[PDB]
mmCIF file of C-alpha atoms in Angstrom:
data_model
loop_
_atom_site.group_PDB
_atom_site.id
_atom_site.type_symbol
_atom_site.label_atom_id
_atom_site.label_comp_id
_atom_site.label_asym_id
_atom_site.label_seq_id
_atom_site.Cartn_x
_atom_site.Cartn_y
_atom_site.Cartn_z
ATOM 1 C CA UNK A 1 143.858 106.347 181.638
ATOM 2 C CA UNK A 2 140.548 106.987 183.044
ATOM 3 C CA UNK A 3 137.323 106.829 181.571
ATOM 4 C CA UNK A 4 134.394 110.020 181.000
ATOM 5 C CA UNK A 5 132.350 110.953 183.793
ATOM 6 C CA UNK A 6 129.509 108.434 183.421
ATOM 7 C CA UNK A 7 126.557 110.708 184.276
ATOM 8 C CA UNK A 8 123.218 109.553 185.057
ATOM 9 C CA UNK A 9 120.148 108.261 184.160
ATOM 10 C CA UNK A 10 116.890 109.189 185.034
ATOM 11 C CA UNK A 11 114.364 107.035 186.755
ATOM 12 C CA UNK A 12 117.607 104.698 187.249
ATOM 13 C CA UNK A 13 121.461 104.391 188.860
ATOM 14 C CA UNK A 14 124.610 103.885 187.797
ATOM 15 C CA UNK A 15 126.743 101.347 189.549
ATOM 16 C CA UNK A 16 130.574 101.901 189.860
ATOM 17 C CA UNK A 17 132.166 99.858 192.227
ATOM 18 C CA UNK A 18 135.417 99.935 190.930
ATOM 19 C CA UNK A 19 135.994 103.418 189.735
ATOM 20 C CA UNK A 20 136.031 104.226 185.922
ATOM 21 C CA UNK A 21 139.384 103.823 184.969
ATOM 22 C CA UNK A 22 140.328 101.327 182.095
ATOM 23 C CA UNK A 23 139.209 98.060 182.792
ATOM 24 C CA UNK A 24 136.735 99.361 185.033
ATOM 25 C CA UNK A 25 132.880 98.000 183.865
ATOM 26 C CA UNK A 26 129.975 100.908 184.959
ATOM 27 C CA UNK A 27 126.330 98.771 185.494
ATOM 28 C CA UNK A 28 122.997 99.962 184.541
ATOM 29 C CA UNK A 29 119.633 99.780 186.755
ATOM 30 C CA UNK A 30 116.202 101.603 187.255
ATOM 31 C CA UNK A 31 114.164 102.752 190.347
ATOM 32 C CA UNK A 32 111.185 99.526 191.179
ATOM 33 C CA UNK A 33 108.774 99.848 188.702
ATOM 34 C CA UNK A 34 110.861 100.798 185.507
ATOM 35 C CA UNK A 35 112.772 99.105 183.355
ATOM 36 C CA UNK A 36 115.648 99.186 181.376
ATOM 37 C CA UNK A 37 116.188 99.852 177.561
ATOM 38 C CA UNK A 38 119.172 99.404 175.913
ATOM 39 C CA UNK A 39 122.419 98.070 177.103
ATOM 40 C CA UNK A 40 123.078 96.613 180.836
ATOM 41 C CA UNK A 41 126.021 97.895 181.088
ATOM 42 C CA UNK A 42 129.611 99.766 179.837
ATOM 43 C CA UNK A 43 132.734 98.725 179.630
ATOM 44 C CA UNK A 44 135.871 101.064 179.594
ATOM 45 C CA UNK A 45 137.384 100.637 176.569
ATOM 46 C CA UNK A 46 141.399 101.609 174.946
ATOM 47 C CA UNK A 47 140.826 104.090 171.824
ATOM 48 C CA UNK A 48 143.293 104.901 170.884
ATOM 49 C CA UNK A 49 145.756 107.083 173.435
ATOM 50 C CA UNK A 50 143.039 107.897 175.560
ATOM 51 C CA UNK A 51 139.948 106.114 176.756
ATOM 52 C CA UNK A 52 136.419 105.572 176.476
ATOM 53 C CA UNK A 53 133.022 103.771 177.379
ATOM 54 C CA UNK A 54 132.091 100.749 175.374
ATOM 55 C CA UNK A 55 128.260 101.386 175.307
ATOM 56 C CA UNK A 56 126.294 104.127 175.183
ATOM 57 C CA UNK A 57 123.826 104.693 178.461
ATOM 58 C CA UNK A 58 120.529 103.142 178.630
ATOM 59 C CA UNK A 59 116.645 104.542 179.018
ATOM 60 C CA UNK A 60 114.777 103.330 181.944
ATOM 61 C CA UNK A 61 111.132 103.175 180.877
ATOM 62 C CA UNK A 62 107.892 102.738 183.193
ATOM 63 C CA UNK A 63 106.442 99.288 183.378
ATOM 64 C CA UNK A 64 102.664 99.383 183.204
ATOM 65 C CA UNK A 65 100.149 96.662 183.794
ATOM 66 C CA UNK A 66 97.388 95.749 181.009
ATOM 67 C CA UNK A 67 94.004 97.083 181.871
ATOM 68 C CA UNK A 68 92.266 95.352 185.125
ATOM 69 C CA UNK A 69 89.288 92.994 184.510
ATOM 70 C CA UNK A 70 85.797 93.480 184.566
ATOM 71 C CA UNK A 71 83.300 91.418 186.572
ATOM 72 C CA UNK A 72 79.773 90.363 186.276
ATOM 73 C CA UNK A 73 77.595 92.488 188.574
ATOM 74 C CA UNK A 74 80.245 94.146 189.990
ATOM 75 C CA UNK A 75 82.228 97.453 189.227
ATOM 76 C CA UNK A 76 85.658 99.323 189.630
ATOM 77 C CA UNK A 77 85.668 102.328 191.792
ATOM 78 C CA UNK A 78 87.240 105.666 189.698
ATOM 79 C CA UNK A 79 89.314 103.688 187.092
ATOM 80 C CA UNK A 80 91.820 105.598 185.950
ATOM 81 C CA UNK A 81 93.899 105.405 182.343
ATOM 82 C CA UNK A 82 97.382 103.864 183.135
ATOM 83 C CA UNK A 83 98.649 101.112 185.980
ATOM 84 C CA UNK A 84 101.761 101.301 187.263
ATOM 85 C CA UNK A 85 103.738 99.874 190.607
ATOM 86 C CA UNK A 86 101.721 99.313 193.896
ATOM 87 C CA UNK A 87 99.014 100.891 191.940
ATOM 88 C CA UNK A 88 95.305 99.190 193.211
ATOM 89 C CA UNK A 89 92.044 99.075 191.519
ATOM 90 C CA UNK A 90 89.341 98.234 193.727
ATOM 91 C CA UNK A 91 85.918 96.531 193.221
ATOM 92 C CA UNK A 92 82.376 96.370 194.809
ATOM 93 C CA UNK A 93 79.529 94.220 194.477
ATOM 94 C CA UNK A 94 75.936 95.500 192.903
ATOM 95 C CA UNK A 95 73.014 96.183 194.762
ATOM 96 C CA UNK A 96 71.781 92.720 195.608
ATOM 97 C CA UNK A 97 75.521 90.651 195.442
ATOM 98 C CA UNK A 98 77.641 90.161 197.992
ATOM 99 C CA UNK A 99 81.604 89.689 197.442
ATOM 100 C CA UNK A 100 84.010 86.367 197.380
ATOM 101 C CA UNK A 101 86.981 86.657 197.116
ATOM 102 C CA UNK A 102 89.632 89.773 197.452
ATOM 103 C CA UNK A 103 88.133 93.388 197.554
ATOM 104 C CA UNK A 104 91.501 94.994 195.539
ATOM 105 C CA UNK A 105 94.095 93.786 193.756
ATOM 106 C CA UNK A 106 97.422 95.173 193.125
ATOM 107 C CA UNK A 107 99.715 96.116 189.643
ATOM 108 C CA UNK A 108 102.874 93.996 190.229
ATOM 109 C CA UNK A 109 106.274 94.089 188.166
ATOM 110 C CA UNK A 110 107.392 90.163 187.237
ATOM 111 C CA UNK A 111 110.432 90.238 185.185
ATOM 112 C CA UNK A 112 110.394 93.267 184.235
ATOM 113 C CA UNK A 113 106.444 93.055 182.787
ATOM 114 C CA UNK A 114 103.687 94.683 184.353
ATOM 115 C CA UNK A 115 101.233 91.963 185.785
ATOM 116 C CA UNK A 116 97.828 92.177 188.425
ATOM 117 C CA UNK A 117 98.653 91.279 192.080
ATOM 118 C CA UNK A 118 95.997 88.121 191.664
ATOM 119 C CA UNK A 119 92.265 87.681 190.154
ATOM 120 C CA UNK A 120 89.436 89.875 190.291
ATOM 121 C CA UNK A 121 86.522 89.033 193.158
ATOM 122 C CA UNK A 122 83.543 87.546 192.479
ATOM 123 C CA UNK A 123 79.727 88.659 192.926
ATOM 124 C CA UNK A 124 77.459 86.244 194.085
ATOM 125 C CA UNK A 125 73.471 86.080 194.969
#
């Protein structure tokens, strides 16, 4: 009366705290900075003389944050093409402006959307 192997899921983890036999529900998750795509969850199911899951596994896809801002006489250092967790973009002032503010900010995760740590710096005279 026990349910499939669940098997795994890349860039994610499957939870089974109480075993996989009938009954039994299997729980979905992905590593800190990914998130999940499809259903939460699986449930062992009756069909017909022998078991199976309810749902089928999930995808755990990488969150990535929007492009950073620009500033007025200032400039990112290297930019790169794609954001992801912990990720930092960091900025200097022009010849001539000095910096307020924070010199880097930081690509967050805030349910389960990719978001900048806070607000660019600022150049000044």
């Amino acid at each position: 009366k026990s349910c499939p192997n669940p098997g795994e899921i890349r860039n994610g983890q499957i939870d089974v705290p109480g075993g996989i036999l009938f009954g039994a529900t299997i729980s979905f998750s992905c590593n800190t900075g990914y998130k999940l795509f499809g259903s939460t969850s699986s449930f062992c199911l009756i069909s017909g003389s022998s078991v199976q899951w309810s749902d089928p596994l999930p995808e755990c896809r990488e969150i990535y944050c929007p492009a950073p801002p620009q500033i007025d006489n200032g400039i990112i250092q290297g930019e790169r093409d794609h954001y992801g967790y912990r990720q930092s973009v960091t900025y200097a002032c022009n010849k001539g402006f000095t910096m307020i503010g924070e010199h880097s900010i930081y690509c967050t995760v805030n349910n389960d959307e990719g978001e900048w740590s806070g607000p660019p710096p600022e150049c000044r005279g």
